[PDB]
Structure 1
């Protein structure tokens, strides 16, 4: 193995009197001729090394053969038809299908044929109350602008000319008269502003005559406004905001002539949104005086915050509310997995929905008179599945099995909890092919993130599935720093407590060995971005803990990350070398780049990154890889794979990592 030559410069940096050498400073410029040449050479070496792997092409083919597959969404009633989305598995955009009691399903709206390239995409979709008219917004390329088209459902032809200059808008019908939408500019003609306004479009009229509903007078100026009409057409709810944090909310009783807007919340101190109404009672989801949120009710005739009353009190877990079939469904995240509770509109707990196991859910959204509801379920061992739920009995039946070439019963996903160094308990979800033997010899990949209040919830991955099909184990740890247990869990993994994140990950690794799942020479750690940091730190503190290290797009230079493009936004979680001498010593103490040491024997490593990236600059990966090649004294290869310029590329990347990981664990033949 012959690593390219990496020039060492004389750049020296100073932090509170302390000097730190940065020999690869020049590699921070990913667009200099010298760096691109370095990239080119590193890739040649990496590829040459991977071409030495016998089963690489086999793993690739297997992945490509299982990567794409058909999908289907839950069906919804609109007028005299049931609608549902479908996807060939190849089609860029989902197609909307329609079905009528008698005949068989038929294609209704295919967004793919609206763009020669398949760019023009479907955004919002809203049917009129009777289901006879369809309003839908389409977005071109990566634009924010929209047009709202009106289609006659029965004929499938354009009802009227489409509405233009629509942006950050919903579409909410008022019976069969027309609908509310948002826009920054008068339907007439004028010069731009950042004053978002709500307009009502009455069918059979020109857009230029749409009436102003909210947002024009100075007292109503806001950057973002939304409008929603309740299912029973009784109330109009208008939200107004200037940012993603907090919003004002107003209500208008449409059952009364020229009713004025009443204020549900007149300040931006908190988030409040409409769930539904029952009679004159409003059901609102809000985080006002409740970080984990609560569901409250208040009469529409006097809706101010002082009159709100808890229907579903704030709990230790963050609440999400869905409504359907005359029921309210409280969704939570417990130990990173879903839990759903059913309630009636009077706050009486009906039952705890019995989900198909531990995982992630979607659905439980429907109309008042839907006889049944649908929900999606999935996790590391089970591909997205559609289930039917009987509101009254609570009976759950399989509606649509996944078309993914992976039979769920052949896989196991068990939940475990271990203890960190200080004694903290941490969740760990291990998945694998059924029939595993706890002999501690299974090629294992341990994944983690740990930070930015990001919570790692289970989700199906074709790549992971293929890993399991190779006899491998996939373990995901919910390290501190994430958002699996509120704020206290997040802070325990930030600033001068970041080391807690690494310890937790370290503890997870030892657990997998102790419990006989794998062993050092059969273990690999993986992570991306803040996750790459995780891998980089752990591999520099405990290079004896694993056999393989797979850091992707990681933040590795902890002393200069903040000076790079987009690095500013991660200061809250990490702190900076400039903050104070104390912060500097901590950052320098674990910074991957600065903790690689000459003479040490590091695990087999494959650093991955794109050649250019604004979120996490390649500089981190380039300098880290260069340092590992120069310092490592063992037999393990320190490689970096740089993606240049797509499912093809994704498939190729997964193959290289798995092929490499297995090849580095000694396998000279696929496991088994």
Structure 2
């Protein structure tokens, strides 16, 4: 099938580079002054201390933080262990710090980073008392689980074949100790299988979870020191999460059945429900002491539920402000949870028998978090969050995603704060295709149902318009598709459009970078039956010259390795063809944002600047 802009898939074509150069200039002249004036306000919010991961050891908590241009790993209220700045001088390059873990004893720490925004990374294992690098592994490994004098770990094969000769993408599990390294699990597994391992709370069992896309899950358990005796004990036609093994009994969180999440247990092959499916999703569950601590997702924010090991509900905990809440780590006694919301970068909580707050960073101001519902084409209620400042200039910045079983739950958007301060309202919409209401909610936005997602977003945008708001619609990656499709269908419901790192060409998405992995979500363009519903919304095929379009910003990054910039370039050329007020920003500086904040903060400042200028 001919494509007039196929040459744009070659990012080294001189025609492509000319366009990128031209449009970055035009965009900079367009928001450059405003962006330079707002940058300090954005930078202030972006760069403040933000926790990443945390770990429990016998010696105390170890946590990572971002602040400004550096990232550190430190003893909680204690010594810095790893400093991204120290690292950069040692290796003489920009470094992104990915994750870390430790041993139970708090004497060994493993952390992974990437030199100069390399697509490859590094793993170092260090001694926590002296700080000596015990080991340095290249490429980086994952899921390090210390035992005795060594550890299990997983490798994810991206470019290379597996040792047993299987093509990527693939995963394999290894054991490493003084005598050396050997593969312990995953031999013969075809491409697409992923694995992870965790210990039981008592340290006696390996719990190994195996996953193939959305439609297969397997659980294995056995003696932590003996992979020869690891046995499959559960099979499911969806990925499930193994929680723990306690007193001969394996606990699993599964979205089998209606798809909302329940906890089952297996003992000697018999399967019992522990906590049956409820009205709202059960997103995670952990066992601590003799209790089950469960994260319940009620209209896309978290309430905390505490149960006995037998599934009798003991207590319920809600939060003052709707938030996202996730388990970071656990030991036998306690779990650490990270909370986040629109005006709360983070809270660090400790759960032992009850919930206790041990750290908080919040943005000061009289901010309100409200919630409402819009009604979609087919009657579906579309929940959304509303964030407001003290002032109301009737200007709304509306964010959605809608896909891939991702719930949109409260989180901190640094560039929205100055917006709220200027009378703006931030809206986060809970569209179909997400996990907000279970696997059925997700399925209701996949393949032929993808139009439902756009209908839900339209319903929110149109509600805001009727209420008198000026409206800027914003989304990234599958969320870029969201705004792009909505723009070509109902440009009349937005006064501004922001399209981030989008998927656009729905007949060729599967031919660029990793896009084939999205086939179960969107459908398969080689099949005419799927093309039939794909072409009904594909933005690349559905630009309407008869329509009037609002100011539109498409933004991407020249060196993104997941969502090919050609989507953005092609949609930009299509809008150019009809003289639409469209802009294109292509980030050229390398790497992402984890420990290289200024490039990312500028990008976000550019978005804020575009909203402020185009809605006025």
TM tier relative to shorter chain: 0.7 to 0.9
1:414 deviation in Å?
A: 1.0
The one of 441, 454, 458 aligned to 1:502 = 454
TM-score (norm. length: structure 1): 0.76
The structure-2 alpha-carbon separation of the partners of 1:166 and 1:236, relative to structure 1 and needing over 3 Å to count, comes to: farther
1:620 maps onto 2:567 in alignment: yes
The one of 374, 377, 383 aligned to 2:345 = 383
The structure-2 alpha-carbon separation of the partners of 1:386 and 1:310, relative to structure 1 and needing over 3 Å to count, comes to: same
1:508 deviation in Å?
A: 0.5
How far, CA to CA, are the matches of 2:297 and 2:552 in structure 1? 34
1:165 deviation in Å?
A: 9.7
1:465 deviation in Å?
A: 2.0
SS in 2 for 1:603: coil
The one of 263, 271, 287 aligned to 1:295 = 263
Q: How does 1:265-304 map to 2 (within 5 A)?
A: 265=233, 274-286=242-254, 292-299=260-267, 303-304=268-269
Residue matched to 1:361: 325
Is contact 1:180-1:228 (8 Å) kept? no
1:431 deviation in Å?
A: 0.9
Is contact 1:74-1:386 (8 Å) kept? no
1:330 maps onto 2:301 in alignment: no
The structure-2 alpha-carbon separation of the partners of 1:273 and 1:388, relative to structure 1 and needing over 3 Å to count, comes to: closer
Is contact 1:377-1:387 (8 Å) kept? yes
Residue matched to 1:171: 145
Q: String of CA shifts for 1:424-474, please: whole Å, max 9, x gaps.
A: 1111111121x345xxx5121112122233321221111122222222111
1:401 maps onto 2:360 in alignment: yes
The structure-2 alpha-carbon separation of the partners of 1:86 and 1:160, relative to structure 1 and needing over 3 Å to count, comes to: closer
Residue matched to 1:603: 550
1:361 deviation in Å?
A: 0.4
1:232 deviation in Å?
A: 3.4
1:181 maps onto 2:152 in alignment: yes
Residue matched to 2:436: 484
1:547 deviation in Å?
A: 1.4
1:118 deviation in Å?
A: 6.4
1:207 maps onto 2:179 in alignment: yes
1:106 maps onto 2:53 in alignment: no
Comparing 484-493 with 443-452, greater Cα deviation is found at 484-493
Residue matched to 1:655: 605
1:411 maps onto 2:367 in alignment: yes
Residue matched to 1:69: 48
1:41 maps onto 2:22 in alignment: yes
SS in 2 for 1:655: helix
TM-score (norm. length: structure 2): 0.82
- If each structure's strand is expressed as a fraction of its own residues, which one has the higher value? 2
The one of 101, 113, 116 aligned to 1:125 = 101
SS in 1 for 2:491: coil
Residue matched to 2:110: 136
SS in 2 for 1:640: strand
1:358 deviation in Å?
A: 1.7
How far, CA to CA, are the matches of 1:338 and 1:290 in structure 2? 20
1:250 maps onto 2:221 in alignment: yes
Is contact 1:322-1:364 (8 Å) kept? no
Is contact 1:429-1:477 (8 Å) kept? yes
Is contact 1:249-1:273 (8 Å) kept? no
Residue matched to 2:419: 467
How far, CA to CA, are the matches of 1:251 and 1:425 in structure 2? 45
Is contact 1:247-1:271 (8 Å) kept? yes
Q: How does 1:544-563 map to 2 (within 5 A)?
A: 544-563=492-511
How far, CA to CA, are the matches of 1:647 and 1:110 in structure 2? 15
Is contact 2:144-2:154 (8 Å) kept? no
How far, CA to CA, are the matches of 2:342 and 2:29 in structure 1? 33
Unpaired runs of 5+ residues, structure 2, are 156-161, 166-170, 590-595
The structure-2 alpha-carbon separation of the partners of 1:369 and 1:512, relative to structure 1 and needing over 3 Å to count, comes to: same
Is contact 2:172-2:183 (8 Å) kept? no
Is contact 2:172-2:187 (8 Å) kept? no
Q: String of CA shifts for 1:187-222, please: whole Å, max 9, x gaps.
A: xxxx95469566485xxxx435x9x89559999xx9
The structure-2 alpha-carbon separation of the partners of 1:583 and 1:94, relative to structure 1 and needing over 3 Å to count, comes to: same
How far, CA to CA, are the matches of 1:471 and 1:591 in structure 2? 35
The structure-2 alpha-carbon separation of the partners of 1:225 and 1:358, relative to structure 1 and needing over 3 Å to count, comes to: closer
1:384 deviation in Å?
A: 0.9
1:453 maps onto 2:390 in alignment: no
1:156 maps onto 2:130 in alignment: yes
1:309 maps onto 2:290 in alignment: no
Is contact 1:375-1:387 (8 Å) kept? yes
1:352 deviation in Å?
A: 1.0
1:360 deviation in Å?
A: 0.3
How far, CA to CA, are the matches of 2:515 and 2:615 in structure 1? 35
Higher RCO structure, 1 or 2 (CA under 8 Å, sep 6+)? 2
The structure-2 alpha-carbon separation of the partners of 1:321 and 1:112, relative to structure 1 and needing over 3 Å to count, comes to: farther
How far, CA to CA, are the matches of 1:562 and 1:213 in structure 2? 32
SS in 2 for 1:458: coil
Is contact 1:381-1:412 (8 Å) kept? no
Say what the alpha-carbon RMSD is for the aligned residues.
3.9
Aligned length: 588
Residue matched to 2:581: 637
Residue matched to 2:488: 540
1:136 deviation in Å?
A: 3.3
Residue matched to 1:423: 379
Is contact 2:260-2:282 (8 Å) kept? yes
Residue matched to 1:87: 65
Is contact 1:609-1:643 (8 Å) kept? yes
The structure-2 alpha-carbon separation of the partners of 1:412 and 1:543, relative to structure 1 and needing over 3 Å to count, comes to: same
Q: String of CA shifts for 1:39-90, please: whole Å, max 9, x gaps.
A: 2222222323334x5x4322122212332112457987644x4333253613
1:232 maps onto 2:208 in alignment: no
How far, CA to CA, are the matches of 1:341 and 1:643 in structure 2? 43
How far, CA to CA, are the matches of 1:170 and 1:290 in structure 2? 34
Is contact 1:446-1:525 (8 Å) kept? yes
How far, CA to CA, are the matches of 1:605 and 1:571 in structure 2? 28
Q: String of CA shifts for 1:245-299, please: whole Å, max 9, x gaps.
A: 4334132399xxx999373517686656653444444444456778555433445
The structure-2 alpha-carbon separation of the partners of 1:241 and 1:642, relative to structure 1 and needing over 3 Å to count, comes to: closer
